[PDB]
Structure formats: structure tokens, C-alpha cells
Amino acid sequence: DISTLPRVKVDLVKPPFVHAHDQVAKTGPRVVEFTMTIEEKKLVIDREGTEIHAMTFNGSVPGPLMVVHENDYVELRLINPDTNTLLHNIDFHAATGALGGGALTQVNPGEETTLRFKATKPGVFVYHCAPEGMVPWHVTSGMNGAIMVLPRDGLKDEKGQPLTYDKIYYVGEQDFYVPKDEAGNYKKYETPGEAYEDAVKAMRTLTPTHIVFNGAVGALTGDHALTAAVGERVLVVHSQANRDTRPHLIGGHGDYVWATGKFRNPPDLDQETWLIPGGTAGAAFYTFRQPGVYAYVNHNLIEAFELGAAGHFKVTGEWNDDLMTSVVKPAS
Amino acid sequence: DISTLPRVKVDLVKPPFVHAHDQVAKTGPRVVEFTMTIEEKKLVIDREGTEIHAMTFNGSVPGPLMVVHENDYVELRLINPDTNTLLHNIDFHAATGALGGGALTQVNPGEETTLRFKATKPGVFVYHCAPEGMVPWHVTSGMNGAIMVLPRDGLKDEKGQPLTYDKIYYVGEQDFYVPKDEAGNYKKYETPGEAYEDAVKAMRTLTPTHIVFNGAVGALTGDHALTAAVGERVLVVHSQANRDTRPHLIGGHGDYVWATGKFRNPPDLDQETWLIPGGTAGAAFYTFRQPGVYAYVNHNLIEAFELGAAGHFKVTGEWNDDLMTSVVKPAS
Amino acid sequence: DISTLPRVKVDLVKPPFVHAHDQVAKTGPRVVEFTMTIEEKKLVIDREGTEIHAMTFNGSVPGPLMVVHENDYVELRLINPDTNTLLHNIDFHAATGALGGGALTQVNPGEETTLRFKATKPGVFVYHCAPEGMVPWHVTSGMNGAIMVLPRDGLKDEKGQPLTYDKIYYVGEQDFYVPKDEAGNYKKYETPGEAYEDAVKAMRTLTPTHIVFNGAVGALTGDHALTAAVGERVLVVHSQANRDTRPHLIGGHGDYVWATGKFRNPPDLDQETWLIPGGTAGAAFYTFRQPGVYAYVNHNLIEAFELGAAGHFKVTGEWNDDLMTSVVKPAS
Ligand SMILES: O=N[O-]
Ligand SMILES: O=N[O-]
Ligand SMILES: O=N[O-]
Ligand SMILES: O=N[O-]
Ligand SMILES: O=N[O-]
Ligand SMILES: O=N[O-]
Ligand SMILES: O=N[O-]
Ligand SMILES: O=N[O-]
Ligand SMILES: O=N[O-]
Ligand SMILES: O=N[O-]
Ligand SMILES: O=N[O-]
Ligand SMILES: O=N[O-]
Ligand SMILES: O=N[O-]
Ligand SMILES: O=N[O-]
Ligand SMILES: O=N[O-]
Ligand SMILES: [Cu+2]
Ligand SMILES: [Cu+2]
Ligand SMILES: [Cu+2]
Ligand SMILES: [Cu+2]
Ligand SMILES: [Cu+2]
Ligand SMILES: [Cu+2]
């Protein structure tokens, strides 16, 4: 009987940050309530000023990470305000039935809906919009995110001992297919609807024009670099709703990796690079051992460095010469 | 001594259906005899009437699933009738030696041959035609299928307890590279031989024009949807002879997945999406928990919804509101 | 204290061969010293005479395999002679800190440097050049290799029993993106520097013109085929620094496969094909059971047979009719 279960309202936060949660559950099963507002908006995705009509959950690409525990209920109030122009919906890969909730959540502009589902399987999972006949266009316009369903007793290593993270970041990687004119210049439209037939042609090339983390080339750099400290245990959740990716932390490793993101399986150890298939979320646990700048990339290095799929960590603390040292610095 | 072993003749069936077999073996090792006839035929692959000269085992794309047990012998009589125009052969990834049988099975039109091999490794495996100098053209013209070598005691979960399926389907996914004129229109040829140099150029783009399940856009829809009932345990074998795929059951999961298809390994659990590398067969076990329509797709959603890699399940039975429910239906 | 550790100088060998080493360590931890000289040179990559300005470690594509044990120190003297034109460096995915050594190893022409790092994680790992702002261009010009860090007690199977290989080969697979004129002909440049803006445009297509093993179409064929004997246990290390590959031994299997190359994980068994993600090295162990010719390919068969990603094994010994036999040879 759901009516006797505690309810908790959670306020979501912008990626790459994640809302406050407990790793090990301090309550029984709950109904966890979330609200998301669909926003269609113009987004500048690169240094050159290229603009798309993005379709977002809660104003961001990716949409925010939701965090619950195994056998909680998720109750999502989904709002499509009448300033939007398109019909949207939501499919949770975490959910069982009705196309992941897609069949039940169709909202025209000016409508809302509330969906509930039981989170029966532990793991990180993609959610994405999937309206009838326009699925890839919505998804590749930025309308995806992830949800993490933690085991009730938190994460475990390959031997079953606890793994506790100190920080958690969510990296959503996005393939965009911006239409081009005859010569190769990116096209512009006043509305999302205008772009549709050009979008389909661009998608069919199977060749994205931009691949980005957190909505833009260079979004996770500078002032917006991910931070940590030597000694900290960091969990990086990474999703790709449509295309394969192969993450790599330059100067580090994936100590414990769930490449396909499902925590009932033992993690892979000591990964240099791991494959997250399109339509999946993965998670990698790392303990920092050296300070400095790290690049976190898709290790198709063309995708990383030409198309945008690169971000930075800045790590503070003490250098360990035993691990690495310059014996003779560059010289004649 | 093979001459003392029982022989059983098996009649193959058209995909997505699979011939009758026993999961747990009720006999000792057998010589299992199959016959396949090569058919070169015109196939319409999409809604627009695009026609290719397909190369098939037994008239279908994919070729039929063959089912044996570990340490049976497979004896295949392969017939290339003189109504065909090309030389064909067969390579079984299940087999050891002579290029998977490829070196021993070269049949011009009007020839036949009989190959025997011992099925020493349990798993689902691709078979495909591979004639000297024309390998990718035959394979990407539809000349591939799979074989399942069950363990003698059937399938097991990650703990080693029995897993028994109630139904089994075979989904062959096919990348086609149909040649285009200057403007983008698909070309037509009277014979397979005519298309050859145009086929090579199209292949070299590495960009397929169509990606389909069971030979055509929409082949596993409507009257041809896969069916099941709530409570049934379904095994879906999925092969891709040439290109990576990432299957996903929309509204469900892969409860137990052998993504690279080899049953001596423990399955991955609770998968949302899994990667089957080109040149591989995989298998996913699911128990249906909700009725309704499910889409089974390659979760590169451009590949799925624009290029054709989508099919349907129709599942009968009782809705479970505990798993999912609409709290407030779409409204103002 | 490093100064009390034995030092051993190792002379590297050209791929696909690997320098002499011990599988099980016969000493305590050592500082293992290597020297590599960067060579920029013209390379002919295909049968048609297509020429690139390759960037190599030690004159080869790939660079040579380095072999150490877990908790050795690697000390690399890296020389960039003044006959080169570009700045290079080295990133080891085996190493922890400073972008894998990349930040510490920047050498202009006429400079050298010596880097030391502790090999803390067992596995096969990629190394590649990665200069600031020119990373994909150097890597896809051939500037990558691998290092193997063996466990101190050698390799183990999925049950933890020893696995001993009799021979070891290193296959580096390389994606090249040679620029084309308007009509599709490959362009030529007098220097590496000339090609730069054309290289970037070619890379951005994400479509390689050639995919090769060991630097050229047909490099591991004929006189240069890999050899073995029936009964021998062979380890094939395979790396791809930038793009996914899916190796397959035609007529054989991967008995024990570490697809993502990290030996603390149990191997996958009985693989037909396995996925090595771009930015990764993998390793596959096979025992030959039949003589004859085997093809070792990327099983995107367009990549294999049209673009160059195919090599040969020639295996000597006794044919086993029990495994495979032609019952009725091709005939009317
Ligand atoms: O500004 N909305 O695309
Ligand atoms: O769009 N809210 O009713
Ligand atoms: O789905 N593309 O990797
Ligand atoms: O294939 N996706 O990088
Ligand atoms: O499902 N990946 O742990
Ligand atoms: O009709 N045979 O291509
Ligand atoms: O083609 N049958 O002999
Ligand atoms: O082999 N192409 O994914
Ligand atoms: O990369 N094959 O979808
Ligand atoms: O080989 N995959 O279970
Ligand atoms: O000959 N050096 O590119
Ligand atoms: O370039 N050697 O000093
Ligand atoms: O990274 N390309 O498979
Ligand atoms: O996707 N690389 O073959
Ligand atoms: O990390 N692969 O065994
Ligand atoms: Cu939408
Ligand atoms: Cu989906
Ligand atoms: Cu054929
Ligand atoms: Cu094959
Ligand atoms: Cu370089
Ligand atoms: Cu790297």
C-alpha cells in the first residue's frame, strides 16, 4: 500500500552536479517526487557561435541526474509549458512497461502529467524523450539524461566490500547533427519546427557535427572544470542516449568500472578506456593519486579534440615522485 | 567412431522462428544433418520499393538459426543450384579449421558439398558466406545467419542454476549499402554481377543506407510482431555479421545477457542496452512483467527509426500498477 | 629507494615481434630502461603507392611493444632528433599523473628527455604521442604503440590456474585519414606540416581511408605472415589508439580474451569476436588445433577486406578430421 509510504520531494540540480542523497539507505522504501519542466531554447554549442534549437529537460543538456534507491517509487511530475511548440514525453530505461513510461506521458504544450514507477533494478540508466515518429530528433536535440538507482546498501567492489564515493559527477555526452548548406556552413532556423526535414537528412549521414559534454564545446573547462583532491574517491556517471562512447581519464584510470552501468554485476578493474554503448549509462570509480590537470575524453580523439568531447579535472594536493617523475627534463 | 552415432535430420524454419529442439539434451552426441539451398533473389527492403539483389541461405535474410548441442557433429549439405550466378561458400564461426569451413565449401552454380564439423564450444555464433575476394559484398547482401550450440545441460544463470526459456526468437540485423546516383537516388541492376563496382564504392563509405531486422524495414511489425505473454521467459538471439549493434527492449530489459554470446561465461544482469560487436551473435533472456506493445531496437536511434532497425513485441496479459502507473493523465 | 634497485636495459624489436621477457618474474622489482627515437618518415600504405608522412616511435607503425612486470619502474629515454620537424611527447595509459607523462615529455627537434613511472596496474595499455592542440593528428599519423605490464606471477585463467603462452605477437591497428581532392584522389605533400589543415578536414569526416595492421595493407601476409604450430599457445596483443575494432581469427577463436586488456579481471572464454574500444589494448590467447592458413581480421569486413585490416597466420602440423572434414567435396 503506497499511501502509507513516506514521500520525499527532491529538488534537482544542474549537471555536472548531482542532488544530495545517501549512498546507503537510511529509510525504508519511499515515493521520491521529482518535477521537471520541459524547456525548448536556443543554445550556442561551440566557439564559432553555432546555434541550435535544443529540447531540454529542466533547461540543461543533459537533463539532471535523478538519484533513488532500489525499490523506491519514482513519481515524476512532467510539465510542458505553453511557451513550447512541440509534443514531448519521457521514456525511462529504469522502468518496466508502457515503453518506459513513453506511452503514458505524452504532453502537448500547456499540459502536464505525473508518472509513477517502481525502481526494481539497480544501476545507472538513461531517460530520454521519445515521441511517436520524432524519436531520434528529440534525443539528438538534447532531450536526455540519466537516473541512478543505488542498491539499498550502496556500491560494492568485485569481492563485495563497500565502495564509498566522496564526490559524484554526471557527464552527459551529446551527439549533435547540425544541418549544413552545400559548402559546409551550419544553417539557422527561427523555430525548432523549421529545421525538421534538414535535421532528418543530417542525422541520416550518421556523422555528427559536434560531440559535447554538458551541452557545449569547452563546457567542463576553466572555471567549470571538475574538481577533486588527491585521496578522494570520485564517481563519474557518463551517459550517451544515441551513440557509442569510450571514456578515458588522461593521467588516470577507471579503478572500478560498470561500463554498461548495472550494479548487480561485478565491476571491471583497472580500465584504461571502457565502451559505453549508445542508449546506456555507465559509471566509473576513481581514487586520485596525483595532483594537476586531467583531461576526461571520449578516446576517439577526433571526437574529443576536433568535435568537442573533452573536459577537465583540476586536482589539488601533493605530487608523488615514486609514481612518476621527470629524470631528465626536455633539453639538447 | 562417427558411424555408430545416431543421425538426425532437422528441417529448418524461416526466421524469426527457430526449429524445434531440446534445451537439455535427451540423447548422447549425434550427427545433426541440415540442408541449405542458396537462393539469389530480388528483395524489396523498404517502404519506397528499393530493390536489391540479395544473396541468401535458404531464401531468407538472415539465414535460418541452426540449433545443436555441445559436442554434436553438424553435417551441412550446401546446395548452389544452377539458377544462381555466383560462387558461394560458408564460414561457421562455431567451427575450428579451414577458415570456418570456407576453404572446403566453394560451390559454383550447379554444385553441392557436404561439410561436417564438431561443435566444441557452446554459444551463439555467426555463419556467413565468404568467397575469396568478394567477402564483404556477399555478407552485406544478406548471406549470413547464426548457429546456437547449447550446453548439454542447457543454460545457466550467474550462480549456475538452470535458466529455461519458454520461447526463442532469432533477430538477424542487416546493414545494406545500396548504391546511389549523384543526387542520392538508389540504383537498380538486372543482375547481382552488374552492381559489383558500385557496391564496393558504397561499402567504402562505411555508411549503410538501410539497417533492418529480418530482411526489410517493418518486417517484425504488425501481423509479423513477435508475441509473448506476461510471465513467459523469452530468449532473443541477435546477430550482426559485419557492424556493431546495441539492442534494447523498449519498456523492458535484458535480465540475463550474453552480449558476445558465449555460454561458458556468466551472463550480465539487468542490462538496459548491450553491445554486440560486428561479427558476433548475442543472446538476451527476458521475463515479461507487463502487457502491451514493446519496441526492440538498435539504440542508435537514427539506425532504429530512420534506417529501419526496429521491431515490435505484442505481449498479452495483466497490467501491474505497482510497477508503473499514470497518477495524473496528460491534461491542462 | 630506487637507487638500490637493479637496472636492466632492454633493446626493443620491430612489431609484430616482441622483445624477450619472462612471463613469471625471476627477479624482484627493477628499473627497466628503454630508449626510443622518434622518426618522421614517408610511408607507402597500400598497393596503389599512396604515401603519407608518418610519425613513428622507433621507425615503425605501431611503435614497439614494451614488456615489464607489475611494480617495476619504466624509465624511457625519448629522443627527438633534429632531422624531425615537429614537437612530440608521450602519454602512457599505464602511468598515473601528468597526462600519462605527456606534460613532462615535450621534446622539440634536437631534444631528449627521460621519464620514469611505476607500473602499478597489470594489463596491456596504449601509449601514444599527444602534443597540445595536435593530438588526433599525431596519433592517426601512426604515433602509438602499447606496453604490457604482466602480473609478477604471469597470466591466469578464470579459475586462477596458470596460462603460459608459447609465442606472442603484437598487432597494432591503424586508422589513417588521407586527404582527397574533389574527385577522390589521395593528395601528396613534401612535408608533414603542409598537410595539416587538409588532415583536420579528413579526420572530421570520421571516415578512415585505410585501416591497416602493422603500417600497411598486406603487411602481415606472405613472407610476413604470423606463424605457429598445432599445439602452440599463442598470445595476440592488439591495440587501437583511436577507433573501435573487433578482432576475429578466421577458423579459430579467442580461448581466453581480455578484450579491454586488464589482467586483474577474469578473461572471457570462447569468443568468436571481441570489441576493443578505441584508446585500448586487448589480448587474446589461443591454442591452435588445426594446420593451414588463418586470417586475423577486424570483423567489420569492409574494414578488413576493402580498407586493409587483415593479416594471416600460417600454422604447421597435423589435420584433425574429427574437428572438421569435407564429407562430399564440391561437385555436380
Ligand atoms: O527558443 N526555442 O527554440
Ligand atoms: O502546463 N501546465 O499545466
Ligand atoms: O552508435 N554509434 O556508435
Ligand atoms: O561510435 N561512436 O563513437
Ligand atoms: O552492467 N554493467 O555492469
Ligand atoms: O534475382 N536474382 O538476383
Ligand atoms: O546443385 N546440385 O547438385
Ligand atoms: O563495425 N561497425 O560498428
Ligand atoms: O556502429 N554500428 O552501429
Ligand atoms: O561471450 N559472452 O558471454
Ligand atoms: O620524411 N618525413 O616525413
Ligand atoms: O636529440 N638529442 O639530444
Ligand atoms: O571510435 N570509433 O569506433
Ligand atoms: O567503429 N570502428 O570500426
Ligand atoms: O579489462 N579487461 O580484462
Ligand atoms: Cu521531446
Ligand atoms: Cu531508449
Ligand atoms: Cu555467397
Ligand atoms: Cu566471419
Ligand atoms: Cu608526435
Ligand atoms: Cu590516450
Q: Show the 3-state SS of chain B.
A: CHHHCCEEECCCCCCCCCCCCCCECCCCCCEEEEEEEEEEEEEECCCCCCEEEEEEECCECCCCCEEEECCCEEEEEEEECCCCCCCECCEECCCCCHHHHHHHCCECCCEEEEEEEECCCCEEEEEECCCCCCHHHHHCCCCEEEEEEECCECEECCCCCEECCCEEEEEEEEEECCCECCCCCECCCCCCHHHHHHHHHHHHCCCCCEEEECCCCCCCCHHHCEEEECCCEEEEEEEECCCCECEEEECCCEEEEECCCCCCCCCEEEECCCCECCCEEEEEEEECCCCEEEEEEECCHHHHHCCCCEEEEEEECCCCCCCEEEEEEEEC
**C127 Cα–ligand 21 center, Å:** 7
Q: Which of A53, A138, A210, A238 is catalytic?
A: A138
Residues A81 and A91: their CA atoms lie apart, in Å, by 19
Residues C233 and C285: their CA atoms lie apart, in Å, by 7
One-letter identity of residue B209: T
Beta bridge partners of A281: A239
**B189 Cα–ligand 6 center, Å:** 10
The CATH number assigned to the domain with range B1-151 reads 2.60.40.420
Residues C307 and B172: their CA atoms lie apart, in Å, by 25
**B34 Cα–ligand 3 center, Å:** 36
Query: CB under 8 Å to A172, separation ≥6 — which residues?
Result: A15, A61, A62, A63, A144, A145, A146, A213, A214, A215, A238, A239, A240
The class of domain C152-318 in CATH terms is mainly beta
CB contact under 8 A, C96 and A252: yes
Angle at A129 between CA A125 and CA A130, to 5 degrees: 105
Distance (Å) from the alpha carbon of B135 to chain A's nearest alpha carbon: 24
DSSP letter assigned to residue A164: -
Q: Which of B114, B93, B96, B94 is nearest to B105 (CA)?
A: B114
Residues on chain A touching C100 (C-beta within 8 angstroms): 250-251
Containing H/E element for C138? Answer: helix C135-139
The arrangement of strands across the sheet holding A66-69 comes to A66-69, A144-150, A123-128, A91-92
Closest atom of ligand 1 to CA, residue A192? 3
Q: Are C286 and C236 in contact (CB under 8 A)?
A: yes
Handedness of CA B55, B59, B61, B66 (dihedral sign): negative
DSSP letter assigned to residue C230: T
Q: Which of A40, A69, A70, A93 is catalytic?
A: A93
Q: How many CB atoms lie within 10 A of CB A318?
A: 10
C-alpha cell of residue B187: 540504383
**CA atoms in the 13 A half-sphere facing the CB of C176:** 31
Query: CB under 8 Å to C108, separation ≥6 — which residues?
Result: A330, C80, C87
Query: CB under 8 Å to C271, separation ≥6 — which residues?
Result: B260, B262, C253, C254, C257, C259, C284
C53 lines ligand 11 (CB under 6 A): yes
Q: First vs last Cα of chain A: how many Å apart?
A: 77
Alpha carbon separation from B258 to A97, B271, C267 (Å, rounded): 23, 10, 14
**CA atoms in the 13 A half-sphere facing the CB of A87:** 15
Q: First vs last Cα of chain C: how many Å apart?
A: 77
Check for a shared fold between C1-151 and C152-318. Answer: yes
Q: Which of A44, A248, A21, A50 is nearest to A149 (CA)?
A: A21
Residues B199 and B186: their CA atoms lie apart, in Å, by 11
Exposed, middle or buried: residue A71 (CB in 10 Å: 0-12, 13-18, 19+)?
middle
* Cα Rg of chain A (Å, integer): 20
Ligand number with the minimum distance to the CA of B248 = 17
* Phi–psi pair at B224, nearest 5 degrees: -105, 15
Q: Is A21 among the annotated ligand-binding positions?
A: no
Is the bond preceding C16 in cis, omega lying within 30 degrees of 0? yes
Residues C83 and C55: their CA atoms lie apart, in Å, by 13
Residues A217 and B138: their CA atoms lie apart, in Å, by 42
CB contact under 8 A, A136 and B304: yes
Residues A49 and A42: their CA atoms lie apart, in Å, by 11
Q: Are B223 and B158 in contact (CB under 8 A)?
A: no
Q: Cβ < 6 Å from ligand 5: which residues?
A: A 258-262, 265; B 268, 271
CB contact under 8 A, A323 and C140: no
Q: Which of C150, C55, C126 is nearest to C276 (CA)?
A: C126
Ligand number with the minimum distance to the CA of A156 = 5
C-alpha cell of residue A324: 612518476
C-alpha cell of residue C31: 628499473
Beta bridge partners of A229: A316
Residues C172 and C319: their CA atoms lie apart, in Å, by 30
**CA atoms in the 13 A half-sphere facing the CB of B81:** 12
Query: CB under 8 Å to A133, separation ≥6 — which residues?
Result: none
Q: Are B267 and B157 in contact (CB under 8 A)?
A: yes
Q: Cβ < 6 Å from ligand 9: which residues?
A: B 243-245, 300, 303
CB contact under 8 A, C97 and A324: yes
Is the bond preceding C6 in cis, omega lying within 30 degrees of 0? no
Residues A234 and B295: their CA atoms lie apart, in Å, by 36
Residues A266 and A260: their CA atoms lie apart, in Å, by 11
CB contact under 8 A, C271 and B278: no
Containing H/E element for C315? Answer: strand C310-316
**C87 Cα–ligand 2 center, Å:** 58
Domain ranges (residues) in chain C: 1-151, 152-318
Report the residue of chain C nearest A267, measured CA to CA.
Answer: C265
Residues in chain B: 332
Q: Are A308 and A290 in contact (CB under 8 A)?
A: no
Q: Alpha helices of chain A — where are they, by DSSP H?
A: 135-139, 196-204, 301-305
Residues on chain A touching B293 (C-beta within 8 angstroms): 99, 103
Residues A73 and A101: their CA atoms lie apart, in Å, by 13
DSSP letter assigned to residue A64: P
Exposed, middle or buried: residue C318 (CB in 10 Å: 0-12, 13-18, 19+)?
exposed
DSSP letter assigned to residue C180: B
Bridge-based pairing of strands A226-229 and A310-316 is parallel
Bridge-based pairing of strands C226-229 and C310-316 is parallel
The DSSP code sequence of A263-279 is TTSPPEEEESS--B-TT
Residue ranges for the known binding site of C are 88, 93, 128-129, 138, 143, 299
Angle at B330 between CA B326 and CA B331, to 5 degrees: 135
Q: Are C91 and C130 in contact (CB under 8 A)?
A: yes
Exposed, middle or buried: residue B160 (CB in 10 Å: 0-12, 13-18, 19+)?
exposed
Report the residue of chain C nearest B205, measured CA to CA.
Answer: C207
CB contact under 8 A, B113 and C302: no
Q: Is A55 among the annotated ligand-binding positions?
A: no
- Which of C73, C87, C99 to mutate against chain A (most A CBs within 10 Å)? C99
Q: Which of A85, A15, A78 is nearest to A53 (CA)?
A: A85
Exposed, middle or buried: residue A156 (CB in 10 Å: 0-12, 13-18, 19+)?
middle
Chains within contact range of chain B (3+ C-beta pairs < 8 Å): A, C
Instruction: Tell me the structure's resolution in angstroms, rounded to a single decimal.
Output: 1.9
Residues C185 and A84: their CA atoms lie apart, in Å, by 48
Q: Is A53 among the annotated ligand-binding positions?
A: no
Residues in chain C: 332
Distance (Å) from the alpha carbon of B73 to chain C's nearest alpha carbon: 9
Residues B270 and B277: their CA atoms lie apart, in Å, by 19
Size of interface A-B (CB pairs under 8 A): 162
Q: Is B129 among the annotated ligand-binding positions?
A: yes
Q: Which of B29, B21, B267 is nearest to B155 (CA)?
A: B267
Residues B189 and C185: their CA atoms lie apart, in Å, by 27
Angle at A185 between CA A181 and CA A187, to 5 degrees: 65
Closest atom of ligand 13 to CA, residue B244? 3
Q: Are B25 and B152 in contact (CB under 8 A)?
A: yes
CB contact under 8 A, A332 and C98: no
Query: CB under 8 Å to B221, separation ≥6 — which residues?
Result: B310, B311, B312
Report the residue of chain B nearest C158, measured CA to CA.
Answer: B265
Place of cell 576493443: C276
Residues C279 and C175: their CA atoms lie apart, in Å, by 12
The arrangement of strands across the sheet holding B66-69 comes to B66-69, B144-150, B123-128, B91-92
Containing H/E element for C204? Answer: helix C196-204
* Phi–psi pair at A270, nearest 5 degrees: 60, 30
Residues C268 and C158: their CA atoms lie apart, in Å, by 8
Residues A23 and A109: their CA atoms lie apart, in Å, by 37
One-letter identity of residue B322: D
Helices and strands in chain A, H and E counts: 3, 22
The DSSP code sequence of A27-41 is SS--EEEEEEEEEEE
What letters, b where the CB count within 10 A reaches 16 and e where it falls short, cover C287-297?
Answer: bbbbbbebbbb
Beta bridge partners of A116: A75, B325
Query: CB under 8 Å to B56, separation ≥6 — which residues?
Result: B38, B39, B40, B41, B63, B142, B143
Residues A253 and C96: their CA atoms lie apart, in Å, by 8
Q: How many CB atoms lie within 10 A of CB B9?
A: 10
Q: Which of B53, B69, B88, B312 is catalytic?
A: B88
Distance (Å) from the alpha carbon of B307 to chain A's nearest alpha carbon: 8
Q: Which of A194, A167, A169, A165 is nearest to A42 (CA)?
A: A194
Q: Are C101 and C121 in contact (CB under 8 A)?
A: no
CB contact under 8 A, B96 and C251: yes
B260 lines ligand 10 (CB under 6 A): yes
Residues in chain A: 332
Q: Which of B160, B124, B156, B321 is nearest to B236 (CA)?
A: B124
Residues on chain C touching B139 (C-beta within 8 angstroms): 301
C-alpha cell of residue A48: 564559432
Nearest CA to ligand 1 atom 1: A41
C42 lines ligand 11 (CB under 6 A): yes
C-alpha cell of residue C270: 570462447
One-letter identity of residue A310: A
Residues on chain B touching A77 (C-beta within 8 angstroms): 328
One-letter identity of residue A2: I
Q: Are A295 and C91 in contact (CB under 8 A)?
A: no
Q: Are B247 and B296 in contact (CB under 8 A)?
A: yes
* SS3 at position C24: strand
Chain C contact residues (CB < 8 Å to B): 207, 244, 246, 248, 250-253, 268-275, 289-290, 292-295, 299-307, 319-320, 322-332
Query: CB under 8 Å to C291, separation ≥6 — which residues?
Result: C230, C315, C316, C317, C318, C319
Q: Are B246 and A279 in contact (CB under 8 A)?
A: yes
Residues C52 and C133: their CA atoms lie apart, in Å, by 21
Residues C241 and C308: their CA atoms lie apart, in Å, by 17
Q: First vs last Cα of chain B: how many Å apart?
A: 77
